[PDB]
């Protein structure tokens with residue numbers, strides 16, 4: 001498989017299907033009122049970048065290999081909603097053109113290198129950013145994930161595969177507004193950092209297929225052991241994305257403030273939007289011990305304990321909303337048939353929004369996601 005992706009306001013989709021995907025230079029030349037949302041800070045950065053052969057970056061159209069990236073995230077936290085946005089799919093076939101350029105990351109950034117087709121090396125390395133589900137500044141992944149194919153002047157509408165959209169309601173309105181069965185409108189929340197599936201059990205409790213860290217819950221729970229290693233699993237991702245959490249985990253562990261059955265709440269004053277978005281909600285981390293050593297299995301008395309702790313202390317500690325992952329359901333080697341009900345039993349008591357994040361490496365029978373099973 002492969003497509004390329006252009007992020008735009010959904011108001012522009014008819015204009016694009018008619019005129020094409022135009023460079024920010026071609027919009028000025030043609031005196032078009034393409035009513036879009038990119039902060040002036042970004043616009044004045046993209047223009048001010050010059051290239052080889054008497055050419056600017058704003059003369060090209062930016063087709064991302066991965067649209068689920070810091071730019072899309074920046075637009076959504078700057079007040080724009082998923083219903084306001086559309087990702088326009090462009091066929092692999094545009095790469096056959098010999099007047100295009102390919103960036104190894106964010107075209108604007110100095111550190112990024114733009115190559116012409118002839119002199120490109122390690123393309124399989126560039127296009128792999130399509131498989132990146134998160135990023136960070138330190139390893140440059142926050143730059144690399146916005147790797148793009150730069151097409152000069154315009155992109156002919158005959159190169160457009162489909163238009164991706166946040167939900168079914170936005171799809172119906174666009175299907176009518178473009179009036180062309182031949183161009184699919186696909187609803188896919190995952191492009192817009194929305195869950196793949198949500199099952200509401202109560203007003204507050206829901207089950208979620210998705211990424212916990214792109215949930216907007218105020219407290220993210222993290223399954224840990226009682227040694228000091230976050231070697232493999234979800235803990236591994238926490239160590240790379242949120243290394244200060246790892247340090248707090250170790251410090252708290254070796255000060256007995258985190259024992260098996262005694263969760264530690266890290267009231268992290270860091271802003272998650274600033275780190276994730278391209279450069280005022282708080283995000284805390286709850287360290288929940290589900291086992292003793294990183295080798296041996298998860299114990300149910302350690303979980304029951306931790307869940308009771310949450311019920312007793314969410315008021316005291318000022319937890320506004322909570323994301324817990326399926327506890328011990330991965331490396332721990334416990335089954336959702338046992339943990340699911342146990343977690344629901346306790347977290348249904350919470351008078352705040354709660355998202356239990358279903359295990360992603362594992363098929364749950366549909367009947368084990370019903371409230372009949374989980375709340376009885």
Ligand SMILES: Nc1ncnc2c1ncn2[C@@H]1O[C@H](COP(=O)(O)OP(=O)(O)OC[C@H]2O[C@@H](O)[C@H](O)[C@@H]2O)[C@@H](O)[C@H]1O
Nearest residue numbers: 211212223225233234235325328329330331332357359360
């Ligand atoms: N981004 C994510 N969003 C939601 N769920 C996720 C995500 N990433 C992983 N999961 C799911 O979370 C579940 C629990 O993750 P694990 O880390 O495997 O938790 P556990 O089984 O309790 O193992 C704990 C052990 O591993 C380390 O995390 C920890 O240091 C301890 O040694 C898994 O089933 C996995 O599918």
